[PDB]
Amino acid sequence: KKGEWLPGLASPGYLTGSLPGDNGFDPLALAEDPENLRWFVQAELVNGRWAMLGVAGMLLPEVFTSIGIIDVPKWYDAGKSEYFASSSTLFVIEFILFHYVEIRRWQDIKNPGCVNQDPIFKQYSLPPNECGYPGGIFNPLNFAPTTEAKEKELANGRLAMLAFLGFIVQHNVTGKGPFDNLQQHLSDPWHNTIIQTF
Amino acid sequence: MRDFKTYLSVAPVLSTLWFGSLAGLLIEINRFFPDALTFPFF
Amino acid sequence: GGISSVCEPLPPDRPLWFPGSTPPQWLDGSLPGDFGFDPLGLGSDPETLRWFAQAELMHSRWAMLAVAGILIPEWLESIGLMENFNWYDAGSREYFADPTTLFVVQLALMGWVEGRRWADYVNPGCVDIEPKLPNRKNPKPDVGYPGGLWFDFMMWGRGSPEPVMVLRTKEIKNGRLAMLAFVGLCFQAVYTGEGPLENLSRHVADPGHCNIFSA
Amino acid sequence: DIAGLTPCKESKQFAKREKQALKKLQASLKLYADDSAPALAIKATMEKTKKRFDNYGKYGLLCGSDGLPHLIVSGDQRHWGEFITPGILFLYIAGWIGWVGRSYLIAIRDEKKPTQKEIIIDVPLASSLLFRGFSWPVAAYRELLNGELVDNN
Numbered sequence A: 001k002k003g004e005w006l007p008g009l010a011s012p013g014y015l016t017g018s019l020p021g022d023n024g025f026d027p028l029a030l031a032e033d034p035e036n037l038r039w040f041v042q043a044e045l046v047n048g049r050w051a052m053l054g055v056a057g058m059l060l061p062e063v064f065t066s067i068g069i070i071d072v073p074k075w076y077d078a079g080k081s082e083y084f085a086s087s088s089t090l091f092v093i094e095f096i097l098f099h100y101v102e103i104r105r106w107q108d109i110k111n112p113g114c115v116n117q118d119p120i121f122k123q124y125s126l127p128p129n130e131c132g133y134p135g136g137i138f139n140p141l142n143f144a145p146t147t148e149a150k151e152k153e154l155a156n157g158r159l160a161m162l163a164f165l166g167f168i169v170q171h172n173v174t175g176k177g178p179f180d181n182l183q184q185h186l187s188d189p190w191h192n193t194i195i196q197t198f
Numbered sequence B: 001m002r003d004f005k006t007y008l009s010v011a012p013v014l015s016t017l018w019f020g021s022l023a024g025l026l027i028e029i030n031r032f033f034p035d036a037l038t039f040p041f042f
Numbered sequence C: 001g002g003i004s005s006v007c008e009p010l011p012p013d014r015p016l017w018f019p020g021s022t023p024p025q026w027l028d029g030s031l032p033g034d035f036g037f038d039p040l041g042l043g044s045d046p047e048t049l050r051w052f053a054q055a056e057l058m059h060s061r062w063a064m065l066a067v068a069g070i071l072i073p074e075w076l077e078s079i080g081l082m083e084n085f086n087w088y089d090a091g092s093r094e095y096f097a098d099p100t101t102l103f104v105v106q107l108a109l110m111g112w113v114e115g116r117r118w119a120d121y122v123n124p125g126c127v128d129i130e131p132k133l134p135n136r137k138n139p140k141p142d143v144g145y146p147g148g149l150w151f152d153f154m155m156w157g158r159g160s161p162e163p164v165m166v167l168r169t170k171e172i173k174n175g176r177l178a179m180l181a182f183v184g185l186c187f188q189a190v191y192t193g194e195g196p197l198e199n200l201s202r203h204v205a206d207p208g209h210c211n212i213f214s215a
Numbered sequence D: 001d002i003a004g005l006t007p008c009k010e011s012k013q014f015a016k017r018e019k020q021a022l023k024k025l026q027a028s029l030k031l032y033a034d035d036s037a038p039a040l041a042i043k044a045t046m047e048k049t050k051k052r053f054d055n056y057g058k059y060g061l062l063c064g065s066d067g068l069p070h071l072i073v074s075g076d077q078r079h080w081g082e083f084i085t086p087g088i089l090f091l092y093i094a095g096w097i098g099w100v101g102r103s104y105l106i107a108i109r110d111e112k113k114p115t116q117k118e119i120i121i122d123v124p125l126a127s128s129l130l131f132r133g134f135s136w137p138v139a140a141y142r143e144l145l146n147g148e149l150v151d152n153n
């Protein structure tokens, strides 16, 4: 289940295969140090999960708007829309809440199993768990966190980060929605590619 | 052939090849993107 | 007695490119088309010799395909079964896509397989395409001469009718002839301003004239 | 209008400088027939000059009282492409070069005769380490965090 990103190339020594989603893809030797690899696993997990949520948010509402079920602005035009609060207050609230929750996450990263307890209602505490996969309240449906689920999550995360990079680059070069780009590609692929937008 | 490749790996020959490739790249960039005072892509 | 599937090196008294001369010490006749021709000593390093042998094989196969795809359609146009064939102007024709996007798609598709071949050359057996059937035993192929179900669906290699060395020298010799032919066609298309078979027709008639010295 | 500088697309002196350049080029052009190679070269130079002046006007550059564009490096967001963006690009490339050189020096440090690998560069290792500087900021930041960037002697 390990596999190879390049069949000819051999896997690095520090990528034995204990970590989920291990295909031996460290050509630049970024994760040679074990502390660096430990940090990069968490960074990959958080970036991939945020990319999942982001790509869903910039793809599915646009698809539903194009279908006609709802009328939602584009992901690049959603900032200028009207809400009950201004963008600055929302940013401040998000900054406060994210400071708290990400400081808690950083404490778990620095020393695992140290911030599992509620600070207000001390009778509530998370069960012992591996770093990056906090069970208990974050897993209400009690899905089994097998290594197959971790590998699937990492694969979908890598695909989502690639999709977000495609999203931002495509909007930078064409100035239109990614699903609009997909429709333009599906209109006639051989004259609607990367080439004819330059 | 190994000795000739070792000679090609010595400092002046490798420096000449590297700097010639770099100079050619810069000259071609200056031909295709001439008179660049700012970075206007962003 | 049976079918030998190993290349047999040529004897040291093999015919050479320059008879009466001493063949170089790094050319011992183990390679296809080995005639002891290395004035510049480019094959002194055995690793570079293997890389150059693979490069010569690749250039041979591409040149044979190229010269076939030039000559056979040109021979069809002269017969009359092709309306407006011209290999020099074939690149500037109108197709269903632009040449740039076709080039990018070709680059991706061909850099898949050229890179699988690279991995095979670096690590023999790392990529296997021939199926591993339950009791069929797959023989280990040489680097640059693969082929089970796909590349050698005829089983004409591996010691069948002509020994592997004989067929490999035949391939290499036809390839060298095709490389020289393709370079000649490329120079003739810009020098004579005409086609290959037309140039052959005006050279066969009055060969004392209509040459390199009369454009 | 930062520091009392008019924009180059709304500057009379910028157009005046373009007029002098085009007039000098036309005076040089008048000596040759229009179908000749020097005339074509002069015409290409004039077209390049016109494109340069139009691009300088449209780029948002601020022109001084002498008709020449003046760069602003104070960090103003309207002029981030004059210094800050090329500065970031240069810092990235220079960090790439420095990180690749440092990695090559570290790799050949524990050899029998390391100096032989400096007068004669070992090309395969250098080409292996060339692309390691693509992610030079991440590697440098982690090495600084793990205390591997510096040597305590």
Ligand code: CLA
Pocket (backbone or CB within 6 Å): C177, C180, C181, C183, C184, C185, C187, C188, C191, C192, C199, C200, C202, C203, C210, C211, C212, C213, C215
């Ligand atoms: C591989 C074999 C080969 C063959 C059969 C031909 C055939 C032909 N060529 Mg081409 N040609 C070739 C390679 C070849 N060429 C090469 C390698 C180049 C340059 C790099 C050229 C460049 C060329 C030019 C510039 C011209 C021709 C023309 C011609 C005609 C000969 C008259 C002459 O003046 O050219 C001789 C030209 C040479 C440069 C000699 C190259 C010979 C190479 C180095 C070796 C071939 C020898 C070898 C024994 C081949 C076996 C022969 C046979 C069994 C196939 C004839 C139709 C002429 C034409 O058609 O005018 C009407 C002409 O103008 N050719």
Ligand code: CLA
Pocket (backbone or CB within 6 Å): C061, C062, C064, C065, C144, C145, C146, C147, C148, C150, C151, C152, C156, C157, C158, C164, C167, C168, C170, C171, C174
């Ligand atoms: C020009 C002559 C030539 C010769 C003598 C050889 C010789 C050799 N090759 Mg090489 N090869 C060539 C050209 C040639 N090759 C080309 C152009 C390519 C690129 C496609 C390759 C790539 C290649 C591969 C990938 C493999 C070989 C292998 C071999 C062996 C098989 C025997 C043979 O090919 O049949 C000798 C007879 C012929 C070549 C006659 C010419 C064929 C005519 C022109 C057309 C074929 C007819 C018909 C259209 C095909 C059937 C139709 C069907 C698809 C419906 C032998 C050592 C195999 C290997 O070494 O494994 C041990 C291996 O699998 N070759």
Ligand SMILES: CC1=C[C@H](O)CC(C)(C)[C@H]1/C=C/C(C)=C/C=C/C(C)=C/C=C/C=C(C)/C=C/C=C(C)/C=C/C1=C(C)C[C@H](O)CC1(C)C
Pocket (backbone or CB within 6 Å): A025, A026, A027, A028, A029, A030, A046, A047, A048, A050, A051, A053, A054, A055, A056, A057, A058, A074, A075, A076, A078, A079, A160, A161, A162, A164, A165, D135
């Ligand atoms: C690994 C490795 C290895 C070797 O060794 C070296 C190298 C190669 C260097 C490395 C690397 C690689 C790679 C490829 C990477 C990539 C990355 C990415 C792309 C990420 C993303 C990432 C991404 C992400 C997170 C994303 C996110 C997103 C989000 C939040 C979103 C948001 C939003 C939404 C929803 C909606 C609205 O309307 C808008 C907004 C507001 C905007």
